[PDB]
Amino acid sequence: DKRFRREAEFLKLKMPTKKVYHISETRGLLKTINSVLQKIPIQPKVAEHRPDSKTRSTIVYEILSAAYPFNDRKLLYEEWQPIDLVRKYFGEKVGLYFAWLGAYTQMLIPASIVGVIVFLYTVFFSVFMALWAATFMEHWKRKQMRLNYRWRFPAYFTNLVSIIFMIAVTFAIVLGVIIYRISTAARVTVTATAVIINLVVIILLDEVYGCIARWLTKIEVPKTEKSFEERLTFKAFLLKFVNSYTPIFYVAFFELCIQLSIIMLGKQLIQNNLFEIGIPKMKKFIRYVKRKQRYEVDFNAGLTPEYMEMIIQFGFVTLFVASFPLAPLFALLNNIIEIRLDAKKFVTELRRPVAIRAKDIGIWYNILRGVGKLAVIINAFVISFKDFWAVLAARLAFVIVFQNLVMFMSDFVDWVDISQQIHKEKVLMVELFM
Amino acid sequence: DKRFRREAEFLKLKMPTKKVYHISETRGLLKTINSVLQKIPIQPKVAEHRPDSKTRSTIVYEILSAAYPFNDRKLLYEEWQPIDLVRKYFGEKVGLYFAWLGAYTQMLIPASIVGVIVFLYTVFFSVFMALWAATFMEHWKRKQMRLNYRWRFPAYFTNLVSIIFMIAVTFAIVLGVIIYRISTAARVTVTATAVIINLVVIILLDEVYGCIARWLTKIEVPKTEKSFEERLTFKAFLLKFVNSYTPIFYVAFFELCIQLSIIMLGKQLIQNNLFEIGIPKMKKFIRYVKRKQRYEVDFNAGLTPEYMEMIIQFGFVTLFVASFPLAPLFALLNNIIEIRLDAKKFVTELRRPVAIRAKDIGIWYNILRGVGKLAVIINAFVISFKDFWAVLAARLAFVIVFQNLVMFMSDFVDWVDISQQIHKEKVLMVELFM
Numbered sequence A, B: 001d002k003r004f005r006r007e008a009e010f011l012k013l014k015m016p017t018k019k020v021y022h023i024s025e026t027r028g029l030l031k032t033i034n035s036v037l038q039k040i041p042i043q044p045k046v047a048e049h050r051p052d053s054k055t056r057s058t059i060v061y062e063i064l065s066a067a068y069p070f071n072d073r074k075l076l077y078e079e080w081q082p083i084d085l086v087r088k089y090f091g092e093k094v095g096l097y098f099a100w101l102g103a104y105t106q107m108l109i110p111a112s113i114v115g116v117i118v119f120l121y122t123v124f125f126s127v128f129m130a131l132w133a134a135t136f137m138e139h140w141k142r143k144q145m146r147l148n149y150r151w152r153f154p155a156y157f158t159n160l161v162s163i164i165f166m167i168a169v170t171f172a173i174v175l176g177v178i179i180y181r182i183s184t185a186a187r188v189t190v191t192a193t194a195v196i197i198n199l200v201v202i203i204l205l206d207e208v209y210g211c212i213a214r215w216l217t218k219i220e221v222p223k224t225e226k227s228f229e230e231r232l233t234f235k236a237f238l239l240k241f242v243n244s245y246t247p248i249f250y251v252a253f254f255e256l257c258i259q260l261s262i263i264m265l266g267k268q269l270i271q272n273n274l275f276e277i278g279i280p281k282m283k284k285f286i287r288y289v290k291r292k293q294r295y296e297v298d299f300n301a302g303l304t305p306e307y308m309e310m311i312i313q314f315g316f317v318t319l320f321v322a323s324f325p326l327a328p329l330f331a332l333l334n335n336i337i338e339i340r341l342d343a344k345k346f347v348t349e350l351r352r353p354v355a356i357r358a359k360d361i362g363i364w365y366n367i368l369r370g371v372g373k374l375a376v377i378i379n380a381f382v383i384s385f386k387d388f389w390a391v392l393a394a395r396l397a398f399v400i401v402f403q404n405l406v407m408f409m410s411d412f413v414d415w416v417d418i419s420q421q422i423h424k425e426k427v428l429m430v431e432l433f434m
Helices: A009-023 A042-049 A053-063 A071-079 A085-090 A091-122 A125-148 A153-183 A189-220 A226-250 A257-287 A288-298 A304-321 A327-347 A365-385 A390-416 A420-431 B007-022 B041-048 B053-063 B071-080 B083-090 B093-120 B123-147 B153-183 B187-219 B227-254 B257-287 B290-299 B304-321 B327-347 B363-383 B388-414 B419-433
Strands: A002-003 A025-030 A035-039 A066-068 B001-002 B025-030 B033-038 B066-068
Touching: A002 A327, A042 A053, A066 B153, A071 A085, A071 A327, A085 A091, A091 A125, A091 A304, A125 A153, A125 A304, A125 A365, A125 A390, A153 A226, A189 A226, A189 A257, A226 A257, A226 A365, A257 A304, A257 A327, A304 A327, A304 A365, A365 B007, A390 B388, B033 B153, B041 B053, B071 B083, B071 B327, B083 B093, B083 B187, B083 B327, B083 B363, B093 B123, B093 B304, B123 B304, B123 B363, B123 B388, B153 B187, B187 B227, B227 B257, B227 B304, B227 B363, B257 B327, B304 B327, B304 B363, B363 B388
Parallel strands: none
Antiparallel strands: A002 A035, A002 A066, A025 A035, B001 B033, B001 B066, B025 B033
16 A cells, blocks of 8 residues: 655654554655555564455555555456455445445346336336335345345534525525426426426536535534444435435426436436546546556545435435336446446546445445335325315325335335354354364 | 153153253152152353353253242242342343333333323323333333343145134124124113123133134144244234224224223223232132241242233223323323232242243334334324315325324434443453453
8 A cells, every 4th residue: 555745754754653563665756746655474463463465455554645555457357246356356345335236236127127017008016116125125135144144512503504504405496496497487398408407407506515515524523434424425315315306396296207217317327427437537638567557557536425326326216116117227227337337437446445344335225225215105195196175085095095005015025044054154163163 | 940740650760861961859759749859069060061049940940740940039028129139039031021011110100190281171192192102112122221231834824714713703803892782772881881791701702712822822833932932922912902902993983982991990900900819819719847838838820911911001001092091090000000919929929930031022022112003003093083075184184194293203212321331341351351
């Protein structure tokens, strides 16, 4: 692993005392910023007392201006399922990211088929769709165990402040859609353009409220780098899910589901893929013996949004699971596509580090559980949506039995291996201990 | 621990080989049935290798016709909160039984106060009552951690058979109430007598369907004595909760809540207390040097129903939590009363054994969680219960927002210590290990 860099020199000598702990390193000088690499077994045996080059620079990070750290990576380049050297090389938490990502593809897999069978020849698609959700959570957890075998008051005042400015942004979005209706007001295509500039403004407000949430999480003085990012993700899916889901919410009570699917595909392709590849050309044209050349390539890395958008994709998977079926299929196309571009995007990365000790997606996981939770009553609530009073009455009745039958089916699924190998493995642990 | 008793003699010698394992015992002969006591430190040190007289006869049971096993018990007799020698003497699982029983009293404690404040001067009692339920589960679990610190197809064919005969008994109860209406048919007091004979018939059908469920669980060939009793309890609360809750269900859709409270108090006093003390007089009049006299007293022990009725008491706590408030207060009187009679009932027991290794009530615990779960929508569903169509419409609307606000408050409570002592305790474990 390497490093970049008066008080920098003196505290650099203070850092060299930490190099004098048990470390072995070297320096490299070019382009008016310092750089220092390192590599060191007996000291790694002391590291083995504290708790395989991935583990090596990993433990170097456990030891610790800027800083950093390929024929097997080229073996990935030909090779890109990928979980073996993906875990061995890319990392564990991101290995879960591509892993449960590919699981999200696997949930996407048989689901679109029955949706095509639906669109051939009506709410049973939504019912068994919710079943597909619960099963997706189910084998998500089961497979999570499988790869687990394969491996003070002013803060709450600011919480109320984020509540108030949050709903202020929400009604601001309501001004986006209502003023969008005024914008297309004075055939369908004027509203299509208003949806185009509207989702463009959503592309604006995503970075706007998003980096605003970076100020919300950055101004919270987070000591730990596990819970601060967690609640930062909580606000992220909060305002972001408000941002995305807000327009379809304006569609529902305040048809245009084709525009919703256009925003789905363009949000997949034109926004995420094309803008994401645009960022590679942004840094690229902004710029535009073996280990020496790779160290030169070092001059040439968040995950949560790349997690969260899949959440948004799951939010794509959930909400309009009410209306139109076929968005799941092309959604799965964007899934496998963004899987491949995710892989090559990881190839394009700025030297992403290791990340150890994680069971699952956690905040994202139970966040998805709650996504199903709000999703059921939500999509039902749109699904039902003189004597017309009694019509809406019967509508509310189907809402009710829809709710009770819905969660009843949810618990019915919730009724649902290698612990035998855990037991005999522990018997072997005492046996080798003997 | 002791024992009672041709092939009995030969297999008795086979048992004496198990006495020749590491055991020390003695025999005693009277009244045409055999009896053998036992007591044995080095062999108990071998028992300490396998995993304090309670632990002694406990491990004797771990070693194993009929069989069995008091100035500290008299110290309980004056002493009867009781958790110290209750755990030390009475046992751990039953110590949880009296423990979370007294916790159920503690939930009963401040709850009746606001109910009196209600009955002075309307659904907010039910709302905060559900809050009292969720908190009851909450500090039930938290206190459970606190005392935790202080310590193939034909079977499913029979499951369908129990379903069919179960609903057959349910409609049979519907014949009980409807034929009870025919019975009082040809002022209110004729219906009071019909309720009297009705609940008497419920007292019949409790033992009837109850021992029928003993045939359901006894004919299931249960190998283990942990899951068979669990599902036996599941059928027990199933048919029993159907039995009790069936009449008020007949009251609701098919006022008489005073008769419901009369069945509550009489079910507490006349049924449970008076019939229970009647069983002591049943065996008593059916019958009607220190260790010698106590061994003579040995000639002179289920728990689940004694658990389950509290469930029924919780089922008393839940359902008519819709209608009338003051049944909680006298219910708490029956709670403290049945706590005392529970204590002296444990004094009256037929030499109850030890029971180790249990975190909590389990089947009963999440059974109570589901009791709240069905309870919320249930009591709401009774609580809302030309243009009268639109009246029931608005009724259904309050049902809906009642449901969403209800579970919303439930999760709001579900947002909610000595693990520090666990950590420093483990630091002391390595330290004493050092």
